[PDB]
Amino acid sequence: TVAYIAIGSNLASPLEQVNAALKALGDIPESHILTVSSFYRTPPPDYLNAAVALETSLAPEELLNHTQRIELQQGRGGPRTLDLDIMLFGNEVINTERLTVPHYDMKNRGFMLWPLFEIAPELVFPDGEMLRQILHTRAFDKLNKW
Ligand SMILES: Nc1ncnc2c1ncn2[C@@H]1O[C@H](COP(=O)(O)CP(=O)(O)OP(=O)(O)O)[C@@H](O)[C@H]1O
Numbered sequence: 120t121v122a123y124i125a126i127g128s129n130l131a132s133p134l135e136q137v138n139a140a141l142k143a144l145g146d147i148p149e150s151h152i153l154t155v156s157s158f159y160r161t162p163p164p165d166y167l168n169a170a171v172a173l174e175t176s177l178a179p180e181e182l183l184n185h186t187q188r189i190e191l192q193q194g195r196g197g198p199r200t201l202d203l204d205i206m207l208f209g210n211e212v213i214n215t216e217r218l219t220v221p222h223y224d225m226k227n228r229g230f231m232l233w234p235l236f237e238i239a240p241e242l243v244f245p246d247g248e249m250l251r252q253i254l255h256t257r258a259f260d261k262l263n264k265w
Pocket residue numbers: 198202203204205206216217218219220221222223224
């Protein structure tokens with residue numbers, strides 16, 4: 120299953136943070152990275168944001184245990200300076216105590232949507248909404264690469 124994960128860091132010099140995170144993402148068992156977006160310096164200091172397409176045989180809650188582990192192990196300041204958010208998990212819709220998939224706010228965030236669109240321009244959400252339409256409709260300003 121293709122999972123799309125948002126990576127965010129508020130570090131002033133967060134490149135290494137994000138590289139640490141990407142390495143660990145690639146080291147998730149039963150998974151491998153398909154594509155990584157450009158890095159984007161986005162208004163909140165400022166964030167470094169990226170999107171990752173991750174092929175995985177893991178159930179969504181398994182994937183979350185791993186991203187949460189990575190936040191603790193690789194976060195310069197634990198989960199607060201490294202944020203790994205599951206945007207989409209294939210076409211699954213999940214509304215559990217631990218997991219709301221698609222991410223409950225991604226449709227409001229250029230810093231999630233534009234990197235996603237870079238790597239998955241033909242993406243359609245479970246409800247049938249198309250990523251291109253949302254960017255069209257909201258007309259989010261294009262982001263600036265890191
Ligand atoms: N799609 C999703 N991806 C990652 N965590 C999710 C999630 N949906 C729900 N969560 C839950 O979100 C909880 C808190 O994670 P935080 O990283 O502190 C939220 P955040 O990313 O800081 O804010 P945000 O959701 O506005 O982006 C986790 O304990 C987890 O159970």
